[PDB]
Write an enzyme that holds these catalytic residues in place. Structure first.
Site, PDB file in Angstrom:
ATOM      1  N   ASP A 297      20.101  70.462  60.539  1.00  0.00           N
ATOM      2  CA  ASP A 297      18.969  70.168  59.577  1.00  0.00           C
ATOM      3  C   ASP A 297      19.544  69.582  58.383  1.00  0.00           C
ATOM      4  O   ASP A 297      19.549  70.387  57.364  1.00  0.00           O
ATOM      5  CB  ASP A 297      18.224  71.459  59.547  1.00  0.00           C
TER       6      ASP A 297
ATOM      7  N   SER B 100      11.745  54.492  50.388  1.00  0.00           N
ATOM      8  CA  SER B 100      11.388  53.285  51.142  1.00  0.00           C
ATOM      9  C   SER B 100      10.963  52.256  50.486  1.00  0.00           C
ATOM     10  O   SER B 100       9.952  52.414  49.566  1.00  0.00           O
ATOM     11  CB  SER B 100      10.921  53.652  52.336  1.00  0.00           C
TER      12      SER B 100
END
Length: 330
Positions: free
Chosen positions: A35, A199
């Protein structure tokens, strides 16, 4: 040194991925959920409340000759999906794919929430976010990666998750045969303890690319792709009959649909998520309404590039002095 381990979807939907991890001496192999959005290595154990264990493999520290109780240490964590666990702490030898760390903090669960109990396939979590998020008190502990880093050939790990198929986590090297083209690297902020990056935009299907900054985290421990409501609405508007359902808890779509791809930007590069990656199947057994793999982050407080996005790429978690993230197509 290096390590290399195969990671395997837990079910037919790729709801999560498990990776075998050797703990203790002799080794006790547990299948952990790696994770990159948390920083605790915790396991079901011989100390876990019996009624809360249902099929998981447990770590029994008393059977490990290298286990040592970390005196006074406790831990308690809550995850973004509302699940939680807590317990005490041992140090022991932990190996992943041939890479060994001695003295790793292994957090033994005394209590786990129902969602953990109900998932027989996940024996615990191995956190790969920054150690500043580790919950051990009163002395915070380091992640497996943080402990291994100085010994690694290169201070990196890579995630290569499969779509409906196994994939690989590598530590200490970049497998140049595992991706196509080049790896595009992008800046990381560690200020919130995550692999947080920005992004450069998105496209829906064959549509034009929208240049827009989207801050979010690369999180292997989250199944879906959570993005701003504007972006998500633009995606689902291209699927006839798709709608946001408050009763179901997100966007659903007719199971008869053909889903468009979704592209996200990494600098000037582009990662294309095929439409099929965005199908999470019937909302309930036998339903013709299917759950979407792209959902709104509104009310999460952060955008999350979870498995839906990451499995479309070869992803480099570069733990150099100034960390960065790399993405390649594959």
């Amino acid at each position: 040194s290096t390590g290399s381990a195969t990671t395997t979807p837990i079910d037919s939907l790729d709801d999560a991925y498990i990776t075998p991890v050797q703990i203790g001496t002799p080794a006790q192999t547990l299948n952990l959920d790696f994770d990159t959005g948390s920083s605790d290595l915790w396991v079901f154990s011989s100390e876990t409340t019996a009624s809360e264990v249902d099929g998981q493999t447990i770590y029994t520290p008393s059977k490990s000759t290298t286990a040592k109780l970390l005196s006074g240490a406790t831990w308690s964590i809550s995850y973004g999906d509302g699940s939680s666990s807590s317990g005490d702490v041992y140090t022991d030898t932990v190996s992943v794919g041939g890479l060994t760390v001695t003295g790793q903090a292994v957090e033994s669960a005394k209590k786990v929430s129902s969602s953990f109990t109900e998932d027989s396939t996940i024996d615990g979590l191995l956190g790969l976010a920054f150690s500043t998020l580790n919950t051990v008190s009163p002395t915070q502990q380091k992640t497996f990666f943080d402990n291994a880093k100085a010994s690694l050939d290169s201070p990196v790990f890579t995630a290569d998750l499969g779509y409906h198929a196994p994939g690989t986590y590598n530590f200490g090297f970049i497998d140049t045969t595992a991706y196509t083209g080049s790896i595009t690297y992008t800046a990381v902020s560690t200020k919130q303890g995550f692999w947080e990056w920005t992004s450069t935009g998105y496209a829906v299907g064959s549509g034009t690319f929208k240049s827009t900054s989207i801050d979010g985290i690369a999180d292997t421990g989250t199944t879906l792709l959570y993005l701003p409501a504007t972006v998500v609405s633009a995606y689902w508007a291209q699927v006839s009959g798709a709608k946001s359902s408050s009763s179901v808890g997100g966007y659903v779509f007719p199971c008869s649909a053909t889903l468009p791809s979704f592209t996200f930007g990494v600098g000037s590069a582009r990662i294309v998520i095929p439409g099929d990656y965005i199908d999470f199947g019937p909302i309930s057994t036998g339903s013709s309404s299917c759950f979407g793999g792209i959902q709104s982050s509104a009310g999460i407080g952060i955008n999350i590039f979870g498995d839906v996005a990451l499995k479309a790429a070869f992803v480099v978690f570069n733990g150099a002095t100034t960390p960065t993230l790399g993405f390649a197509s594959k």
